[PDB]
Structure 1
Amino acid sequence: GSVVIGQRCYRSPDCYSACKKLVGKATGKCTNGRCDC
């Protein structure tokens, strides 16, 4: 959906190198210190 992953984050760009490896995902958003792709 939104897909929460293990990678932690302060800002949403922190998530790009992780989320972009998921089919159809790019940056995601940072929420509760986790990447929501």
Structure 2
Amino acid sequence: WCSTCLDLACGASRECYDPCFKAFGRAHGKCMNNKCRCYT
């Protein structure tokens, strides 16, 4: 299926930016399936 995906339901940039930047490293992802999917 996927890999760089967070269990956080998108809806707010900072909400998915803080985690994606602290989990994967860089803040660069999108909101797919109502969930923020970080990609590079």
TM-score, normalised to structure 1, is 0.62
RMSD between superposed Cα atoms in Å:
2.3
4+ residue stretches of structure 1 with deviation over 6 A? none
CA offsets, 1:1-37, max 9 Å, x none?
86011111136x2410110012442131111111111
Which secondary structure does the structure 2 equivalent of 1:26 belong to?
A: coil
Matched residue, 1:25: 26
Q: Distance in 2 between matches of 1:21 and 1:5?
A: 11
Q: Give, as a single letter, the amino acid of the residue that structure 2 aligns with 1:27.
A: H
Aligned-residue identity in percent = 40
Contact conserved, 1:16 with 1:27, CA < 8 A, in 2? yes
Structure 1 regions of 5+ residues with no counterpart? none
**Rg larger in structure:** 2
Tell me which protein shows more helix as a share of its residues: 2
Structure 2 regions of 5+ residues with no counterpart? none
